Design a protein around this ligand. Structure first.
Ligand SMILES: Nc1ncnc2c1ncn2[C@@H]1O[C@H](CSCC[C@H](N)C(=O)O)[C@@H](O)[C@H]1O
Ligand SMILES: Nc1ncnc2c1ncn2[C@@H]1O[C@H](CSCC[C@H](N)C(=O)O)[C@@H](O)[C@H]1O
Ligand code: NA
Lengths: 387, 376
């Protein structure tokens, strides 16, 4: 399937991390050291030992990605035609998974995760029914699904990146022991260091032990696909790259209507080319009286993207696609916090329940005692209730 | 010479094209996006077209600022239409970023951001440094710190190799601007992080101070080229060996009491050349003050340059590499360049052109390093 071609590319990308990282961050720095004058070499006498340590760290990270790949390979059978090589974007995504894994599965990143948990968890425990059905769009490798399902909620994550999905199935189902894996997730960042040894900091993952998903006590599932495709409205939503009209997705959207008690968007609401599709989908999938909790920045992903996609409408009489627009820009609709909440309250029958602005929180941020990494984002937080 | 003038002409043309570029880049596709969404979602954003009209108006105003800077420059430069190189998208993007730079250096709103450095540098200079001392400011941008320090009676030389910066600088320093004479809209190219979309269209008055008591001058060129060592330095893109530059470097040795690097030490492909130049240009007993992040500009650049030697060759000299930590920079300065550590602070959060309005959710800024080292 097309799914299998994508998965193959990601698995090969995992297997090739070491070679790519050596080429990308190691080789030219050996060449740079070699090219400076002996006089300048003496100013940095430990540079070559540093580069040896950086190479060792790359090899360890390669061991992690190889283990994830082998785990995926125990359950996927290809075709000769379905094995396609990864491009450079695949390799960069694989390198950034180190940051994602640090963020979602290390003890050092606990406070960064507590920005959201410290606000959402008290609210859920006191005012929302465990057990409840919670949907988590753009769930990443799925830490939040573990935390919430361990409180007894039925948690469905949604994720369209196969990089994320493959790491996710590894971290959730491989039976990892607490602190089993040592990775070096900061070695691709060469900036902001007070002490260079911090860049080579070892990080143990996962920071939590395995716990069973038990029927009737909080489960986990995942829609692999685009959010709007999996759960969108079945009428009135333009078809695009992120919205298809095949029978499968029409059925998934039909069963998705009023199916969730809670939607939690966490660094997600700003990821799309049309946030209004996201708002429509949240209102569709939530029951009356359900709550949408959002936490994260408003850093619009396509703000500088001048690409265009193709959009259509579904003809009511024929059911066929119609009203073709092949010049639909990806940029646009970069809405403010106030306008998102105002659209929800005045057009989608929501009532504002909680709101906080300017919550400084990092994303995969180095958190050591002398950290000077980029401080993070000013995050917006709100809870709206459908009615 | 000729290359210099061609470069200046091209930057001037970029200024003249700001309006057309900004319309293409941030306006047109958003009108097309509004036009393309369904009528129901259009009803979700009823003020969007009024917003786009206000955005176009702001673009017009910023274009007026850039045209004024360009014509001021055009009172001294003549160029054939055919000899001018057409600006590329990087030139236009730098021109758009000048809005942020001008906000940072010439608005009242950016005072606290400038005060991260000023609150530490000014007391140190007043208490511990000679009156009318000679101060060098590498990568000085549009030159606000030169005005601030020269107004305290210090003789200030700025150094800046970007003609975007230089042209705006000569405008802000040498034209006849009155305080608050200009209205720009410096946040309109950022569509993210807004609590209120009106904040994106905030008008900003510049300049908050009159430029026209020490003197002020500027070396237009690369820092290491203007003031580097004359022996033992590799010839590169940022180091030339013409008799001009050899001469300037000869007159540069032990010519300055203070070097102030402000968001500069991380801009080059070889920070050791920067340290060599700082140690060279400072007198014994001179002060190097540094403030800023360690965000290395070429960390992800896989390009290579060409460097060679003369008595009186490598075509694969990478730009990346030597991304040194704070501790290692200070340790190289003290242990190899005869410096003594005098002051130091790490993790000073400070913005760079940060929107500072009442409901700001703009990126918080950088975790900055600060130090004072004394040559000996
Ligand atoms: N249209 C869409 N449908 C499903 N997932 C999406 C999506 N657009 C982006 N994503 C996913 O959303 C995530 C944004 S990053 C945030 C990951 C996670 N929620 C966390 O806070 O750590 C990525 O995993 C990205 O692949
Ligand atoms: N090799 C070099 N020689 C001289 N100037 C340089 C340089 N590399 C970068 N610069 C300049 O250094 C500045 C970095 S941005 C900071 C500008 C100013 N000091 C401020 O704090 O606002 C830019 O103006 C850039 O053009
Ligand atoms: Na619903």
């Amino acid at each position: 399937q097309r799914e299998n071609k994508a998965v193959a590319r990601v698995i090969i990308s995992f297997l090739k991390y070491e070679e790519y990282a050596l080429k990308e961050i190691y080789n030219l720095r050996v060449k740079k050291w070699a090219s400076i004058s002996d006089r300048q070499k003496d100013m940095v006498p430990n540079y070559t030992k540093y580069l040896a340590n950086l190479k060792a760290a790359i090899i360890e990270n390669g061991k992690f990605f190889r283990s994830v790949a082998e785990y995926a390979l125990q359950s996927i059978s290809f075709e000769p035609g379905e094995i396609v090589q990864p491009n450079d974007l695949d390799m960069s995504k694989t390198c950034s998974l180190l940051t994602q894994v640090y963020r979602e599965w290390s003890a050092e990143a606990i406070s960064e995760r507590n920005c959201l948990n410290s606000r959402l968890v008290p609210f859920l425990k006191t005012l929302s029914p465990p057990k409840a059905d919670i949907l988590i769009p753009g769930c990443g490798t799925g830490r939040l699904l573990v935390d919430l399902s361990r409180m007894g909620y039925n948690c469905e994550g949604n994720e369209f990146s196969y990089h994320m999905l493959l790491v996710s199935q590894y971290m959730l189902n491989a039976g990892l022991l607490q602190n089993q894996i040592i990775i070096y997730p900061f070695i691709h960042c060469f900036s902001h260091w007070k002490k260079i040894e911090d860049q080579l900091s070892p990080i143990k993952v996962p920071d939590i032990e395995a716990w069973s998903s038990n029927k009737g006590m909080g489960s986990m599932s995942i829609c692999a696909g685009s959010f709007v495709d999996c759960y969108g409205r079945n009428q009135g939503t333009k078809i695009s790259s992120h919205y298809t009209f095949s029978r499968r997705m029409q059925l998934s959207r039909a069963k998705a209507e009023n199916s969730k008690d809670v939607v939690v968007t966490n660094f997600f609401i700003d990821t799309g080319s049309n946030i209004l599709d996201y708002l429509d989908t949240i209102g569709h999938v939530l029951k009356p009286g359900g709550i949408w909790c959002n936490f994260g920045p408003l850093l619009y992903h396509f703000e500088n993207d001048h690409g265009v996609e193709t959009t259509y409408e579904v003809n009511p009489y024929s059911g066929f696609q119609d009203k073709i627009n092949d010049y639909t820009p990806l940029m646009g609709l970069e809405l403010s916090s106030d306008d998102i909440i105002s659209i929800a309250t005045n057009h989608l029958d929501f009532e504002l329940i909680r709101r906080e602005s300017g919550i400084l929180c990092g994303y995969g941020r180095y958190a050591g005692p002398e950290s000077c990494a980029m401080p993070g984002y000013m995050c917006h937080y709100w809870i709206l209730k459908s009615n």
